[PDB]
Design a protein around this nucleic acid. Structure first.
Ligand SMILES: [K+]
Ligand SMILES: [K+]
Ligand SMILES: [K+]
Ligand SMILES: [K+]
Ligand SMILES: [K+]
Ligand SMILES: [K+]
Ligand SMILES: [K+]
Ligand SMILES: [K+]
Ligand SMILES: [K+]
Ligand SMILES: [K+]
Ligand SMILES: [K+]
Ligand SMILES: [K+]
Ligand SMILES: [K+]
Ligand SMILES: [Mg+2]
Ligand SMILES: [Mg+2]
Ligand SMILES: [Mg+2]
Ligand SMILES: [Mg+2]
Ligand SMILES: [Mg+2]
Ligand SMILES: [Mg+2]
Ligand SMILES: [Mg+2]
Lengths: 233, 55, 117, 245
RNA sequence: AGUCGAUCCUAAGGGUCGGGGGAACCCCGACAGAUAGCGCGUUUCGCGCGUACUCCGAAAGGGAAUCGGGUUAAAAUUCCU
RNA sequence: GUUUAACAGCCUGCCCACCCUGGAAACGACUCAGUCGGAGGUAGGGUCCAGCGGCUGGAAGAGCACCGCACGUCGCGUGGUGUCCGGUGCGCCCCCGGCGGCCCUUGAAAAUCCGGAGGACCGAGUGCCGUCCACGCCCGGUCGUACUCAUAACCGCAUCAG
RNA sequence: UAACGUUAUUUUACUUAUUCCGUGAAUCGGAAGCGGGGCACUGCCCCUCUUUUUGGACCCAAGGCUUGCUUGCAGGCCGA
């Protein structure tokens, strides 16, 4: 008991060698990491034209969760389900004399088909991924949806859209019709999305983005402004 | 010719701290310097504590 | 994640040993340097005979690709005789010659008589 | 019609520096947290001669700030420094000959050597034997210090640039006459193939503008244009004046 | 020929990856970069270190180890003792 | 002509360097030259370092010289004696030691080897854990190796006074 | 010499393009705490990051709190 004692270490310039510390912010990262970080920095710094800036304002968290839990029950059949349905149809063709089957109600995907449905005015709701690369594929989609009076929303995750439609990624999704039991909630989500995106399209058309400097330069500017205000008062 | 398999240990070892590397006078000087410097460090720390107590 | 080193090191990733679907070569190659190919023929010059008589040593003409270990193994296989040491040289004509000294348990003269020189 | 010697210099391969026996570059420690904020102590272990360099160099051993090992450095020796001396490098280092300090901490009128041009470059100014820079004034508004260089020029550098207190050792070397060609041969043998030098008027026209003639003479003004192409730019280049003062 | 050399090391330098040029033959050469790997214990996996060439370049530089005596027409610090 | 190899042991201990006692002017010691000493001289006693130094084993059984017997065509046969004791040196070749002069010249790197600072970790009671100690056991690849190296063995058209 | 508009030359602001420098990319920016000073009274503002008689050494955490279960030992926070 009396043999135990403290051995404090005096850490400082010229003192005891410091212990292992977090050096993550000083790491010489690989080229890919460095470039992907600098790309984000440059996009933040440069001024974003309104057409691209409109993609920074995505659907709110609660609204997105509601929309996606709604979409999960309209997913397209997977490969196993398709094969099972096809084999059942083949088995029952002759025996059941080709019985009629109700038209399926599922989400639509694929930029070609979505654009065609929007142009034909069959689409009732459009969902656009915010991180499409190259973004020229969907930068005009909000304008087309506004012109066709089709409610559209911009959501986070082409990967999440692809997961909805059993794909790695999906540029956009579309709903053309909804079930009777879901019509009321679909109308609710539709009015929310229309008030969020479609009605603000005109005002967002003139709003530029970007122009955000680094934290250190922001602090310098704030210090200069504080000095100026203190001197002026 | 200094290889262990070729030369006896006593021929290549000196029985003292830093034996075979530092001379006896150098080792003595190092020991004295270490002891005196640690003593002066203790003296400085005690003097600083006493001054802090006084103020 | 906590990084204590400023330098970035490539992480270690699993590697797999080759498991080819087909063998590139259908079957293993033949053993070109067998004992018969190693031992061409004994030397029957005056110097070779003197070596046999005096130093209990046989003189052989050997494949240039053969080493001392292979020469010893080939001599053992061919004649069932131990070797104390094998010395080798390459003659100016380009062929390898080997002085193979048998152990005292074996008689070079008897071995030569059995071989047929 | 032939490439002149001055032109051939640039290709090198016989005009490259002779550096076989040199002891490595002489420079300050890499600027780090300890030197930026406090001070770091090292010990001078040896004073050595660097072939081809008039000024002696000093080997200094430091304790690594954050590793268990010795940090070895080679500084341009300042006059008065000796083996076993303690050297202090940092912003808070005392103003003593041999210490390396940021120019912001060096009062006006101070004599320094091996002055940095860019913060952290480890010293580029006033490194030759007997040479030094003088601190003239400070400007806190833009954080810049003014210095007088050995040539007499006044230069403005960031106040964070470091400099060693004192003048470079080995001064007065050039006072001694050499008296013979052998001394110059030995001097330049460890520097580069730049000696002896053949006068242009002693050559034929093919290899020098000054060559030729039945008498030895230039035949045209030895002052040449600043924009004269290589091979033609010989003599007194862009001279604003000539002759005695 | 384990003992004499090459072989090993590196010198001036040479040849290169990546990168940068170049119509291209090629040019610069570790300089635009996720290095080779190295130690400890092991359910062969874990832990800890890891500054972009572990390449060529000396039968006079550096460097593991042999001595007498004898022997052939011609070999020996290599053959015999 | 009257010889003694590598290697192993013991002894010795150049010129230096180092250690203990002690405390010096009337200064002393000292080299061819210098130089050294209260930061400890002279003096007394020791330690270490080199050796291509000494003795022993190797090793006299070998080599050499001399004197005999024998086959006398082919015994590479057979036997004895000696190989000892001193001197000398601005001598000659090589190696080493220690000083001094010279430089605005300061006169390579790496492989490799040795030593040291630290002590995480580690063992038992008639056996355990370690052990750079002594002895014993096994193995050691590939290529070059003849000869000339020159008034004829290389180059100069040659067996060329270069 | 200004309301409108054209033209030319200078001064100056930003940093992400671009250029340059240093490093084995090892404490960069802001704030807050531990200590030291004054004020008058409980708050303010002003400063520091621990090392300067010596040719020494310095790494791989002691200690405290807290969990698995009662520790072969192992997992977290402070120390930092
Ligand atoms: K030319
Ligand atoms: K020259
Ligand atoms: K001249
Ligand atoms: K002329
Ligand atoms: K003239
Ligand atoms: K290229
Ligand atoms: K390269
Ligand atoms: K060699
Ligand atoms: K022998
Ligand atoms: K030997
Ligand atoms: K040890
Ligand atoms: K030979
Ligand atoms: K030769
Ligand atoms: Mg790397
Ligand atoms: Mg003249
Ligand atoms: Mg390439
Ligand atoms: Mg190698
Ligand atoms: Mg005899
Ligand atoms: Mg120890
Ligand atoms: Mg010819």
């Amino acid at each position: 008991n009396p043999l135990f004692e403290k051995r404090p270490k005096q850490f400082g310039i010229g003192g005891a060698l410091p212990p292992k510390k977090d050096l993550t912010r000083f790491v010489r990262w690989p080229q890919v990491v460095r470039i992907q970080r600098k790309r984000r920095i440059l996009k933040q710094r440069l001024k974003v034209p309104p057409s691209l800036n409109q993609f920074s304002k995505t659907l709110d968290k609660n609204l997105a969760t509601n929309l996606f839990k709604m979409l999960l029950k309209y997913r397209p059949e997977d490969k196993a389900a398709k094969k099972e349905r096809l084999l059942k149809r083949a088995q029952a063709e002759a025996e059941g004399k080709t019985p009629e089957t109700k038209k399926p109600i599922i989400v639509k995907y694929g930029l070609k088909h979505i654009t065609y449905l929007i142009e034909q005015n069959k689409a009732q709701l459009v969902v656009i991924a915010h991180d499409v690369d190259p973004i020229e594929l969907v930068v005009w989609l909000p304008a087309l949806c506004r012109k066709m009076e089709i409610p559209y929303c911009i959501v986070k995750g082409k990967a999440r859209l692809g997961s909805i439609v059993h794909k790695k990624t999906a540029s956009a999704l579309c709903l053309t019709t909804v079930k009777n039991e879901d019509k009321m909630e679909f109308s609710r989500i539709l009015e929310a999305i229309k008030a969020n995106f479609n009605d603000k399209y005109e005002e967002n058309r003139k709003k530029w983005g970007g122009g955000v400097m680094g934290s250190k330069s922001q602090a310098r500017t704030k210090a200069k402004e504080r000095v100026l205000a203190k001197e002026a008062a | 010719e200094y290889k262990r398999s070729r030369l006896s240990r006593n021929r290549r070892t000196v029985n003292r701290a830093y034996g075979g590397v530092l001379s006896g006078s150098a080792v003595r000087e190092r020991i004295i310097r270490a002891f005196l410097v640690e003593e002066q460090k203790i003296v400085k720390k005690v003097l600083k504590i006493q001054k802090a107590k006084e103020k | 994640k906590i990084r204590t080193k400023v330098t970035f090191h490539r992480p270690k990733t699993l590697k797999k040993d080759r498991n080819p679907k087909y063998p590139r070569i259908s079957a293993p190659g033949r053993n070109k340097l067998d004992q018969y190919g190693i031992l061409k023929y004994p030397l029957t010059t005056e110097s070779a005979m003197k070596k046999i008589e005096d130093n209990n040593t046989l003189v052989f003409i050997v494949d240039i690709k053969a080493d001392k270990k292979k020469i010893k193994d080939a001599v053992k296989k061919m004649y069932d005789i131990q070797t104390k040491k094998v010395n080798t040289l390459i003659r100016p004509d380009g062929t390898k010659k080997a002085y193979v000294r048998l152990t005292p348990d074996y008689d070079a003269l008897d071995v030569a008589n059995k071989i047929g020189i | 019609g032939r490439v002149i010697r001055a032109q051939r210099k640039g290709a090198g391969s016989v005009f490259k520096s002779h550096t076989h026996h040199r002891k490595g570059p002489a420079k300050f420690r890499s600027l780090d947290y300890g030197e930026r904020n406090g001070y770091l102590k090292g010990v001078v272990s040896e004073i050595i001669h660097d072939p081809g360099r008039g000024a002696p160099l000093a080997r200094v051993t430091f304790r690594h700030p954050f590793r268990y090992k010795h940090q070895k450095e080679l500084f341009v020796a300042a006059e008065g420094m000796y083996t076993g001396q303690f050297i202090y490098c940092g912003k808070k280092a005392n103003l003593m000959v041999g210490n390396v300090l940021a120019l912001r901490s060096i009062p006006e009128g101070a004599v320094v050597c091996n002055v940095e041009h860019k913060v952290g470059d480890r010293g580029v100014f006033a490194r030759c034997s007997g040479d030094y820079a003088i601190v003239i004034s400070h400007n806190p508004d833009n954080g810049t210090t003014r210095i007088k260089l050995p040539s007499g020029a006044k230069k403005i550098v960031p106040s964070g640039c470091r400099a060693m207190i004192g003048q470079v050792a080995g001064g007065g070397r050039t006072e001694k006459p050499m008296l013979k060609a052998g001394n110059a041969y030995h001097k330049y043998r460890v520097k580069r193939n730049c000696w002896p030098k053949v006068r242009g008027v002693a050559m034929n026209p093919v290899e020098h503008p000054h060559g030729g003639g039945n008498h030895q003479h230039i035949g045209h003004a030895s002052t040449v244009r600043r924009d004269a192409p290589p091979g033609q730019k010989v003599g007194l280049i862009a001279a604003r004046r000539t002759g005695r003062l």
